[PDB]
Amino acid sequence: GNPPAEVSTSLKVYQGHTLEKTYMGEDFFWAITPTAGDYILFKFDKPVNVESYLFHSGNQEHPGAILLNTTVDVLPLKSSKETKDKRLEDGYFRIGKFEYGVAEGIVDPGLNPISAFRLSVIQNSAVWAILNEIHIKKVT
């Protein structure tokens, strides 16, 4: 499973599809018409040495119900230059982005351990998106 975390979001829960249940692998999450400034937040119970991440949106039957113009940000516990240029003014590093509804990648190990993952919606969208896979892989 995923590292134990408190999860939260500015997107209103639709018909009991809680983000908690999605982070526990039980159900999907409806993200209805995301707006610029919306966020999805995963705050790990303890800092996590993260190897890689995978977020999937859309599904069979609803293949268009994907997250658009959303980034993947990580908040290191502590405060390469290539990764340095990805720093945002709030301390997060903007390391990933959704495309075709999928965001996947590696964490620069210089960032570890991570205290939070944040998905940031950058632009308005008319889609009723389905976030159906959240995978954060610990380092071994």
Residue numbers in the entry: 381 to 459, 465 to 525
Sentences from the paper on this structure:
N-Acetylglucosaminyltransferase-IVa (GnT-IVa, also designated as MGAT4A) forms a β1-4 GlcNAc branch on the α1-3 mannose arm in N-glycans. Downregulation or loss of GnT-IVa causes diabetic phenotypes by dysregulating glucose transporter-2 in pancreatic β-cells. In this study, by combining bioinformatic, biochemical, NMR, molecular dynamics, and crystallographic analyses, we discovered that the GnT-IVa enzyme has a unique lectin domain at its C-terminus, which is critical for its enzymatic reaction.
Because we could not obtain diffraction-quality crystals of the wild-type lectin domain despite repeated trials, we introduced an alanine mutation at D445, which corresponds to D877 in NagH and is supposed to directly interact with GlcNAc residue. The D445A mutant was successfully purified from bacterial cells and showed no retardation in gel filtration analysis, indicating that the aspartate at position 445 of GnT-IVa also plays a critical role in the sugar binding, as observed in NagH. We successfully obtained well-diffracted crystals of D445A mutant and determined the crystal structure in unliganded form at 1.95 Å resolution. The overall structure of GnT-IVa lectin domain adopts a β-sandwich fold composed of nine β-strands with three short α-helices. As predicted from sequence analysis, the structural comparison with NagH GlcNAc-containing disaccharide (GlcNAcβ1-3GalNAc) complex demonstrated that amino acid residues that directly interact with the GlcNAc at the non-reducing end in NagH are completely conserved in the GnT-IVa lectin domain. Four residues (Y819, W836, D877, and W935) are completely conserved in GnT-IVa (Y394, W410, D445, and W513).
